Every structure is written in C-alpha cells, then in structure tokens.
C-alpha cells in the first residue's frame, strides 16, 4: 502493501522511485487521539474495447464468491436485461412470433429487443435469487465508460477478509486490481472538525489554489496534501517522508539491483493544547445556554463564541462557536473565534485605562466626575449607570460600573483638551488616535494575536484623522472591531501581569515512527512573549482590581454571574449596541480569569444580536459554569 505511487526519475538508463506514507496523528494534551488514519480499500475493474459479452459475467461470477455486494444501485432495466442473459431458456419462449419477424427481416433488432425488455416483469422476473443480483451488482459496475477507465466495483466497507481473498486470486481474475488508502478518522465526531481542517483526496490531488506554494517545494498534483487549518498549517510535520530507491538499467530491460536510499517513515505526531474533555463540556454548556437565552427572548441572536486559555502561557484549552438561525439550528463555527470580528463594547476599557497611564493623561486612582457631558451644538454622552446625576469615581470604580464618561474624559485629556461643558471637539485627533490605538495594541487589541492557524484577522481598523466622535467611541469599544481571540489575549495579558503571549494550539511535536506508540518528543511549541505592556505594576493592579470589583462588588456589572464561582474570578463585560436589518440589538461580551490570585484560566465570550435590554439576560453564566467545572477539585 500500500502506497499509491508518485514518480520515476530517468537519466541515462537510471531510475528513481517514491511512495506515499501516512500522516501524523493529532492528539489532545493528555494523548487522547483526535485525528487518526483509517484504511480504505477498494476494488477496481479495467475494461476493454476488446472484451465484451461474457468474460464480464465470467469475472463477475468468480468475484461474487470473494465479496458480498450492495444492490441499492441496480435498476429494473439491468435486472430486465440480465434476465435475458440468464434465461435464454424462457426468453426464447417469450419471443416465438417476433423471432420469425426479425428473421424474415420485417422488424429490426432494436424493436425486437424493446419488445422483449417489455415482455417480462411479472412472473419470470421474480426468478432471480439473491445469488444473481449479486453477480449483477458487479457486472453493472463493470461497464459505464469504455476504454481503460478503472471503474470502482466496491468502495465503501471493504472488509480485510474481502480485500485479501481477492488480492489472492488476482491471477484467476482478469481485469481486477485492488488498492488501499489512508483517510482521516475522527473519534470525537464533529468536535473541532473545522479547526483540524482537511486533506485533499488524490482524486483532488492538490487543489487549484494552494498550488505554486505547494509546487515551489516539490510535490505532485497526484499528491494528497493539507487543504486547510491545522492540516494546512502543520503540513510539513504531519506529512511523512517518502520511500525512495535508485536503479540500474541496461540492455532493453535489465535491472541489476537497487540501493534503498530512504525507507519511508510516517508523519510526526502532533499534540494539541486542547483538553478534549473540557472542549466537549464547553460545546455542551454553550448549547444549554444558547437554548436558555433563546427561550428568554434572544431568538435573533445569531453567533455565540467562547475561547478558553491558560493565560500564563497561551495554551488554548477550548475553542467553541455556533452560528444560530432564527429557530435554533446550530452550525459549528469554531474558526469564528479568530476569523470573524465584532463590535465588543465596554470591555476594552481596561486597555484604554492602560493607555492613559502610559501617556500621563491620567494616573492611578485619579478620580473624576461621571456626569452627562454636553458638547457644542447640543451633543451629549452619558454613562448608562448614571443617566442624570453626578458622581465622582475612581478608575477602578469606572471599571466596576462600566462608566463610559470616565473613559471619554481620559480620551480627551489624552488629546490635550480636557473636558469643559459646552466645549467643541478637537477637529484633529490624529495623534491621540495613534497613541490610544498603540496602547490598545500592546494588550492584543488591534493586532493579530500570532495564533498558529491561517486566516487570523486583526479586526476592522478604520482611520482616525478628524472624526473625534469616533476617537471617543474607540475608547469604549465602539469603533474598531475585534476577534474573540484578541479579547482573550488581552484579558490574559492583564491576568499575567502585563505579558502579551502568542496564543497557540499546537503544543508539542513527536518523532513517531512506530504505529500507535507515541515515540520521543521532537519539538515543543511555545507560546512566545510578544511584548510587555508599557506600564508599572501599580498601574496593572489598578486594572486587575477594577476587574475583580466588576465581578464581586454588589454594583459590579458581572456580580450576578461570577460572584459565587468556586474560586474567585475577575473580569469585565461589554454591551455594544448594534443593528440587524434596521432593528436594535446588542452584542454582549465577557472576559475574565481565575483564580484572581494566581490565574490558571482566562476566557472570552461573545454573543451577537441579543435583544436590547430592559431584561438583562445573563449569558455570563456560561462563563461561571466553565470556571466551576474546570476547578471542581482544588
């Protein structure tokens, strides 16, 4: 045996060869196998413009002893016709008169036949035992096209008993070859299928696009390769090494001997950071919660993603994501966490603060008045929690309350232009934008996170020249948009004291050569440190405290979902207003980590297009439930 063959180099009467191994497996972080190779055998016939009538049914009669066949493809016509083949007996006795007419030459053959494959279907068709549809189901498949088109006879479900029996008699069977190939096998089901990706099927060879890049390394378009995501991304490890000989030709045939240069070897096995038992439970809770939220009003809500990370080193432990339709039909959408972007809202604020501290615009514990701002001509902004009054508050109480206006004042102070009632808005915020977007970037927001998959988007980044109103919105998460992974990289950076680490999913690579044994560690796949935030540890602890307050103080936004986590949790929410077909909606985001005192888990969650609240759905619960399940025993 097995190795659907590749190539034959040819110099001056000298030959070289190359054959195909199977791909690395793919394992969870405790070794549980996620992606295996299974064997698919398959019997082929090869017909001739020079073997018609009977030597068909002669091969087919022999084969209907080594294999059993699926007759779900036979047709009344083929039955009809095969009847004539098989009963020259009763057939000759059906066309007694027509025989003569054909013979005297007053009906053609055509007509004779059509009149015959019309004469029977009742009594004498039910003269076909199971034996014969068996030999027919092979015969049928033994011609569809002429020439040497190697038509498959049995494809699905070819038992090792069957493949052996018939490779064993290939001699007695003229026309019949047998192959075996390797096809991926997914023990855990749909789970993470979209992230694993896909391999072309050699019928495909390499597909039209990925070419060049595949050929500028050295492949056949016969070759099966990695068509997407993990398979695409660790192609050069999950692929084997190839079997390779060199030959000595002479005379008009002679080959004196070969020397084995490269014996072969299966792909290196790849271990993921996933914990599949966590992964599965997350998918579970997600759905319980989508169904819970739909039955409280959220019938238009249409996405729901969740990343879970270990913030001390970037490990992605789970990654989940459904699309929802208007009646609840889930589709898997795990790639959604880093290929889609959303407006996230009030949950970037801890990064905005960290941009103010860096630039002297504010400093730790600076208090300010939350009140309706009034701008020239009559524009007003306000914090939801305080639509009408006036309230002085810290930064860390700004995070707890999710005060938009503490963040607008910070934003203006950063733009050289502190708030004064009546004021007009700086007509040129270019350099404040640059400073503030550079601060957010430092915690992951706005950049690609570095993840080891393709198609990571850094989010929609529209410009900042003279749109002050936007510049402000950007300080409360309502201009630039972000992937749920960025949210998860940012909350993790807060959680590990200002280190922004590359998320990864690939964890370790293994030298596998024997089958099913793992074999030695080859390479680790580190979550690299991208950058440290430009901030004092007193600045970082202010934010951390604000996050802890937002989850554990009676007036925190995340009180009713995170206060009774089995271990203390910290985080932050956002509720961005959005529109869908002109109706009013909210995205709704969560981020957090636990335990507060030495975090081992960090997460982001996104729901999109929930209803606008009077009734505050509590989609954080999904987050509380994951922290509770993760930490069930400490």
Ligand X SMILES: *C(=O)[C@@H](NC(=O)/C(=N\OC)c1csc(N)n1)[C@@H]1N=C(C(=O)O)C(=C)CS1
Contact between 557 and ligand X per CB under 6 A: yes
Q: Which of 575, 604, 608, 610 binds ligand X (CB under 6 A)?
A: 575
Nearer to ligand X among residue 450 and residue 556 (C-beta): 556
Is residue 574 a contact residue for ligand X (CB under 6 A)?
Answer: yes
Span interacting with ligand X, options 226-234, 328-336, 492-500, 570-578, rule CB under 6 A? 570-578
List, as own/partner pairs, every contact residues 511-517 make where C-beta atoms lie below 8 angstroms and the sequence separation is at least 24, other chains included. Answer: 511/268, 512/24, 512/25, 512/266, 512/267, 512/268, 512/269, 513/265, 513/266, 515/266
Taking the C-alpha atoms of residue 546 and residue 351, their distance in angstroms, rounded to an integer, is 12
> DSSP secondary structure string, 535-556?
--HHHHHHHHHHHHHHHHSTTS
Distance (Å, rounded) from C-alpha 97 to C-alpha 91?
12
Given candidates 303, 309, 478, 552, which one binds ligand X under the rule CB under 6 A? 478
Q: Which residue, 18 or 346, has its beta carbon nearer to ligand X?
A: 346
Window 328-347: contact mask with ligand X (x via CB under 6 A): -----------------xx-
From 225, 308, 576, 617, residue interacting with ligand X (rule: CB under 6 A): 576
Q: 262 or 296: whose CB is closer to ligand X?
A: 296
Interface residue with ligand X among 63, 398, 414, 476 (CB under 6 A) is: 476
Write out the binding residues for ligand X, residues 271-310 only, by CB under 6 A: none
User: How crowded is residue 148: how many other Cβ atoms within 10 Å of its Cβ?
Assistant: 10
First to last CA, the chain: 52
- Stretch of residues binding ligand X (CB under 6 A), selected from 351-359, 361-369, 456-464, 473-481: 473-481
Window contacting ligand X (CB under 6 A); options: 286-294, 419-427, 471-479, 486-494 = 471-479
Residue choice 121, 248, 379, 384 for contact with ligand X (CB under 6 A): 384
Closest C-alpha among 85, 79, 59, 58 to residue 129? 79
Using the rule CB under 6 A, is 569 a contact of ligand X? no
Contact between 398 and ligand X by CB under 6 A: the answer reads no
3-class DSSP assignment, residue 112: helix
Q: Choose one: 3-11, 247-255, 520-528, 575-583; the region binding ligand X (CB under 6 A).
A: 575-583
Segment near ligand X (CB under 6 A); pick from 283-291, 328-336, 476-484, 493-501: 476-484
Cα–Cα distance for residue pair 106/330, rounded to 1 Å: 66
Stretch that binds ligand X, among 102-110, 437-445, 475-483, 535-543 (CB under 6 A): 475-483
User: Computed from CA positions of residues 335, 336, 340, 346, in that sequence, does the dihedral angle turn out positive or negative?
Assistant: negative
Q: Which is nearer to ligand X, 444 or 571 (CB)?
A: 571
Task: Please provide the DSSP assignment of 75-87 as one string.
Answer: -HHHHHHHHHHH-
> Least separation, in Å, of the C-beta of 461 and ligand X?
19
Respond yes or no on whether the N-terminal peptide bond of residue 595 is cis (omega within 30° of 0).
yes
Q: Identify which of residues 478 and 512 has a Cβ nearer to ligand X in the complex.
A: 478
Q: Which DSSP category does 95 fall into?
A: -
Give yes or no for residue 573 binding ligand X (CB under 6 A): yes
Quick one: 441 or 588, whose CB is closer to ligand X?
A: 588
Q: How far is the CB of 3 from ligand X (least distance, A)?
A: 58
Q: Count how many Cα atoms sit within 13 Å of the Cα of residue 291 in the half-sphere of its side chain.
A: 7
**Which alpha helices (DSSP H) does 415-532 contain, by range?**
430-442, 468-474, 484-495
Q: 439 or 620, CB closer to ligand X?
A: 620
Cβ atoms of 92 and 191 closer than 8 Å: no
Closest of 417, 450, 454 to residue 432, by C-alpha: 417
Closest CB 400 distance from ligand X, rounded Å = 9
Count of residues that bind ligand X according to CB under 6 A: 15
Spatial distance between the Cα atoms of 23 and 265, rounded to a whole number of angstroms: 9
**Smallest separation (angstroms) from ligand X to the CB of 407:** 9
Known catalytic residue at 346: yes
Of residues 513, 396, 494, the one with CA closest to residue 440: 494
Q: How far apart are CA 226 and CA 197, in angstroms?
A: 8
CB of 193 to ligand X, least distance (A): 33
- 3-class secondary-structure state, position 256: coil
Residues numbered 399 to 418 that lie near ligand X (CB under 6 A) are 402, 404
Catalytic position from the list 346, 383, 561, 602: 346
Draw the binding track, 579-608, toward ligand X (x: CB under 6 A; -: no contact).
-------x----------------------
CB closer to ligand X, 413 vs 572: 572
By Cβ distance, which residue is nearest to ligand X? 346
Considering only residues 344 through 363, tell me which ones interact with ligand X, judged by CB under 6 A. Answer: 345-346
CB atoms within 10 A of CB 517: 9
Q: How far is the CB of 586 from ligand X (least distance, A)?
A: 6
For residues 529 and 484, give the distance between their C-alpha atoms in angstroms, rounded to a whole number.
19
Closer of 121 and 615 to ligand X (Cβ): 615
If you search the block for the tokens 């430009």, which residue do you land on?
A: 534
Whose Cβ is closer to ligand X: residue 5's or residue 384's?
384
Distance CA(178)–CA(387), nearest Å, equals 77
126: which residues sit within 8 A by CB, 6+ positions away?
A: none
Q: How far is CA 430 from the centre of its chain?
A: 38
Binding positions for ligand X, rule: CB under 6 A: 345-346, 384, 402, 404, 476-478, 557, 573-577, 586
Active site residues: 346
């Amino acid at each position: 045996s097995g190795s659907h063959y590749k190539q034959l180099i040819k110099n001056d009467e000298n030959i070289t060869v190359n054959e195909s191994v199977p791909r690395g497996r793919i394992l969870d972080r405790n070794g549980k196998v996620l992606v295996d190779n299974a064997s698919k055998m398959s019997i082929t016939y090869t017909r001739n413009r020079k073997t018609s009538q009977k030597e068909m049914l002669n091969t087919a009669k022999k084969l209907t002893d080594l294999i059993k066949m699926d007759t779900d493809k036979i047709t009344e016509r083929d039955k009809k016709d095969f009847w004539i083949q098989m009963y020259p007996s009763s057939a000759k006795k059906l066309m007694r008169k027509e025989q003569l007419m054909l013979e005297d030459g007053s009906i053609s053959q055509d007509q004779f036949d059509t009149q015959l494959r019309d004469k029977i279907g009742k009594k004498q068709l039910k003269q076909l035992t199971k034996k014969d549809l068996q030999v027919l189901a092979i015969y049928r498949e033994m011609n569809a096209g002429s020439t040497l088109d190697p038509q498959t006879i049995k494809n699905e479900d070819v038992s090792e008993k069957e493949y052996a029996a018939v490779s064993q008699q290939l001699s007695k069977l003229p026309g019949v070859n047998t192959t075996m190939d390797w096809d991926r096998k997914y023990p855990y089901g749909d789970t993470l299928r979209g992230i694993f990706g896909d391999v072309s099927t050699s019928t495909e060879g390499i597909p039209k696009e990925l070419t060049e890049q595949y050929l500028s390394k050295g492949y056949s378009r016969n070759d099966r390769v990695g068509k997407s995501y993990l398979e695409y991304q660790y192609e050069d490890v999950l692929k084997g090494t190839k079997k390779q000989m060199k030959y000595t030709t002479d005379k008009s045939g002679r080959v004196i001997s070969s020397e084995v240069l490269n014996p072969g070897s299966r792909g290196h096995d790849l271990q993921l950071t996933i914990d599949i038992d966590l992964q599965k439970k997350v998918e579970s809770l997600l759905e319980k919660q989508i169904s819970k939220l739909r039955s409280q009003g959220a019938k238009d809500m249409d996405n729901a993603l969740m990343v879970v990370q270990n913030p001390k080193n970037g490990d992605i432990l789970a990654i989940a994501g459904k699309q929802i339709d208007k009646q609840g039909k889930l589709k898997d959408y795990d790639i959604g966490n880093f290929t889609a972007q959303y407006t996230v809202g009030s949950s970037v604020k801890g990064g905005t603060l960290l941009a103010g501290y860096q630039n002297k615009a504010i400093n730790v514990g600076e208090t300010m008045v939350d009140e309706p701002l009034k701008f020239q001509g009559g524009l007003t902004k306000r914090s939801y929690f305080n639509k009408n009054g006036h309230v002085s508050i810290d930064d860390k109480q700004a995070l707890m309350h999710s005060s938009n206006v503490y963040m607008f004042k910070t934003a203006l102070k950063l733009a050289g232009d502190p708030y004064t009632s009546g004021m007009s808005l700086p007509n040129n915020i270019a350099d404040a934008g640059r400073k503030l977007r550079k601060g957010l970037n430092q915690v992951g927001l706005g950049l690609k996170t570095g993840i080891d998959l393709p198609n990571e988007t850094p989010g929609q980044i529209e410009p900042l020249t003279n749109n002050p109103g936007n510049y402000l919105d950007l300080a409360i998460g309502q201009y630039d948009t972000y992937t749920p992974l960025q949210l998860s990289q940012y909350v993790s950076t807060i959680a590990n004291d200002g280190y922004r680490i590359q998320p990864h999913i690939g964890l370790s690579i293994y030298e596998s050569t024997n089958k099913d044994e793992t074999g030695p560690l080859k390479r680790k796949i580190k979550g690299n440190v991208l950058n440290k935030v430009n901030n004092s540890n007193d600045e970082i602890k202010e934010v951390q405290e604000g996050f802890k307050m937002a989850f554990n103080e009676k007036q925190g936004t995340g009180y009713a979902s995170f206060r009774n986590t089995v271990v203390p949790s910290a985080g932050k929410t956002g509720t961005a207003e959005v529109f869908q077909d002109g109706e009013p909606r909210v995205n709704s985001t969560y981020i957090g980590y636990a335990p507060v005192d030495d975090p081992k888990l960090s997460f982001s969650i996104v729901y999109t297009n929930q209803p606008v609240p009077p009734p505050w759905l509590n989609g954080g619960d999904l987050g509380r439930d994951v922290i509770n399940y993760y930490f069930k025993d400490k």
